[PDB]
Paper text:
Human ATP:cob(I)alamin adenosyltransferase (ATR) is a mitochondrial enzyme that catalyzes an adenosyl transfer to cob(I)alamin, synthesizing 5′-deoxyadenosylcobalamin (AdoCbl) or coenzyme B12. Mutations in ATR lead to methylmalonic aciduria type B, an inborn error of B12 metabolism. Human ATR is a homotrimer with active sites that are located at the subunit interfaces.
Electron density that could be modeled as AdoCbl but not PPPi was present in the 1.8 Å structure of R190C and 2.2 Å structure of E193K ATR·AdoCbl. Structural overlays revealed Cα RMSD values of 1.6 Å and 1 Å for WT ATR·ATP versus R190C·AdoCbl and E193K·AdoCbl, respectively, indicating that the mutations do not induce major conformational changes in the overall structure. More of the N-terminus was disordered, and both structures were resolved after residue-79, as previously seen with WT ATR·AdoCbl. AdoCbl was bound in the base-off conformation with Phe-170 positioned at a distance of 3.6 Å from the cobalt atom. An overlay of the WT and R190C ATR structures revealed subtle differences in the position of the ribose ring. The mutation replaces the salt bridges by a hydrogen-bonding network between Cys-190 and the ribose oxygen that is mediated via two water molecules.
Author numbering:
A (entry chain A), B (entry chain A), C (entry chain A): 78 to 130, 142 to 240
The structure:
């Protein structure tokens, strides 16, 4: 069980660090959501502390992510298909963050199952992966980059 | 077995997203193989669908990768030694993609062993890791960056 | 046991490749520690060879990392708190490298436990994660970027 905790906190750290690099690309251009990614890094620090102690993890950050998801989704065109992860430098970095966030979620789920950590931790990471997907699309749109949809 | 499928599709996604970021660095310079990386992202979407359904996975993309590997290898100097992963921004990003692709292959192999997915999926990822290695060397060469070989 | 070796050598490779990309960002600016990261890539090649053969792994590189850690730590302000992984492009890329290095260490530890590889390999990766943390802080400081500390 302690192996699983080290894996979970390590991959949360890998996620926060990948977001840190994406944040650098954002502040360099004229994007205003850098502060949202920085706030997420603070919550990921609290996630790491919660995994390592089970402990309480409030649902406040989950509802905040849901609010941001709604805000960006309502500015995007309809989408009912997978997109190629691309869309510009910021968008592609956010899709990498998104995939790492899904990997962190996979490491947290067993801990939730064994009752070792709050289920809200896994739900936060689940919403974060949707936030990162939506934010990538938003950045690509704001940069005038076309959303690429493969079907065959 | 369902844990293994989520791990395999997640790491395929992580691979396609890392390639998306490398693709951004490519289109920014005067490199012409951006369309090859984009085609690979489409096949990786088909890989994800095949892992998630076992299902048929044609060998067409494998032979196409083998053709591209031959095309680039025949323009490179001889190499019988490990290189330091570097060679410029594009080349170093492709070596990271290459390592992630090997990790995706490690997640797919157990599914092939249990008969749960087509062996052609693992062979595609195996050839992709050779393609990404060769493409990194090619990008480094086209940029005039020296191939670094450590021996001691 | 052979699955574990492939996982360990693959994640060492992923680490060296991530360092290669960080190295590209370093040489682009006026930072002088590019040669230290390149030397680390050479040792990581030797780590891969040691994991794959158990085999001897000298402690020379460990003491060299400890010397470099001391050199940079003695130029930094005191820190008794977690920082948000950021600090500029180079610093944030090094924090990602740091997290990947911790993941490589997690893959090496079981091999050390089963007596299959030298414990010095795990200690090298442990010191490398401290080196990458310290180097990130140093790069951020040299760039005039403020160290971000979240508490709440
Ligand atoms: C396996 C799977 C994945 C895998 C592999 C996907 C792939 N490359 O094939 C991975 C982990 C990579 C993945 C990622 C995502 N997924 Co997914 N995935 C699935 C799944 C389970 C099967 C997909 C499949 O194999 N389809 C077979 C192929 C041949 O179908 P297709 O012709 O491409 O048609 C698909 C699309 O039209 C898709 N679709 C329909 N509406 C929408 C809307 C959006 C925004 C997207 C992206 C897709 C989508 O549904 C069809 C049927 O699968 C479906 C649920 C299901 N059982 O169908 C969810 C599903 C398509 N995924 C979903 C989501 C949310 C996503 C992500 C945005 C998650 C995230 N935050 O990272 C990403 C998007 C990735 C991208 N580049 O666009 C949703 C989409 C609807 C929605 N918005 O609620 C679904 C329907 C699951 C659900 N929530 O109910 N997914
Ligand atoms: C463990 C291993 C790895 C590990 C660790 C490697 C390391 N850092 O030590 C990892 C997973 C990182 C790795 C990666 C790769 N590997 Co490898 N690896 C091996 C292996 C199994 C042992 C290597 C070893 O420990 N040698 C001990 C050290 C001390 O030997 P050395 O003095 O450095 O001499 C080696 C090189 O000269 C090498 N070599 C000979 N010809 C060539 C050609 C090329 C292009 C390269 C890169 C190396 C190479 O062979 C010698 C003996 O190992 C060998 C097969 C074997 N049993 O020897 C394959 C081998 C060297 N790998 C091979 C390949 C293809 C690669 C990759 C290109 C795979 C990919 N697409 O990612 C990368 C290259 C990475 C890089 N930066 O250059 C091939 C090279 C020949 C070829 N082209 O067919 C081999 C021979 C396997 C095979 N296919 O038969 N590998
Ligand atoms: C779980 C854990 C992690 C997890 C999650 C951390 C998190 N986000 O909560 C992960 C794997 C991400 C992590 C990473 C690191 N960790 Co850690 N970690 C721990 C641990 C075991 C518990 C942390 C915790 O949950 N605290 C609960 C929260 C609420 O406490 P807090 O109010 O934030 O107060 C903490 C800080 O003040 C911290 N602290 C005190 N002095 C210093 C100095 C430094 C440089 C740092 C970064 C922190 C630090 O100690 C307090 C108590 O934990 C502690 C040891 C312990 N049992 O306390 C080590 C510890 C804090 N980690 C330590 C280190 C070295 C690090 C890394 C630099 C390792 C590396 N090279 O990557 C990184 C720093 C990451 C960053 N962004 O700053 C050291 C710090 C002291 C030192 N320099 O020796 C400790 C004390 C372990 C030890 N070596 O004895 N860590
Ligand atoms: C969109 C699809 O992605 C798969 N899915 C959901 N969460 C994860 C995760 N953390 N890692 C990988 N795959 C995941 C499910 O199959 C879902 O339906
Ligand atoms: C080049 C060497 O890399 C190792 N190898 C082959 N495929 C993978 C993979 N997916 N992940 C990690 N290591 C791998 C084998 O030992 C091979 O000989
Ligand atoms: C700083 C904290 O990080 C955790 N820790 C130590 N090494 C690793 C690793 N390789 N991967 C993940 N977490 C690790 C321990 O709990 C330590 O106290
Ligand atoms: K992993
Ligand atoms: K960049």
């Amino acid at each position: 069980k302690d192996d699983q905790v080290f894996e979970a906190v390590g991959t949360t750290d890998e996620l926060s660090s990948a977001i840190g690099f994406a944040l650098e690309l954002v502040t360099e251009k004229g994007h205003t959501f850098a502060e949202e990614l920085q706030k997420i890094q603070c919550t990921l620090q609290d996630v790491g502390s919660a995994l390592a102690t089970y402990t309480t993890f409030k649902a406040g950050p989950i509802l905040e992510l849901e609010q941001w998801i709604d805000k960006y989704t309502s500015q995007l065109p309809p989408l009912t298909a997978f997109i190629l992860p691309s869309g510009g430098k910021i968008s592609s970095a956010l899709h990498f963050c998104r995939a790492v966030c899904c990997r962190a979620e996979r490491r947290v789920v067993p801990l939730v199952q064994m009752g070792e950590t709050d289920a809200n931790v896994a739900k936060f990471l689940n919403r974060l992966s949707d936030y990162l997907f939506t934010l990538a699309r938003y950045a690509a749109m704001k940069e005038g980059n076309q959303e690429k949809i493969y079907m065959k």
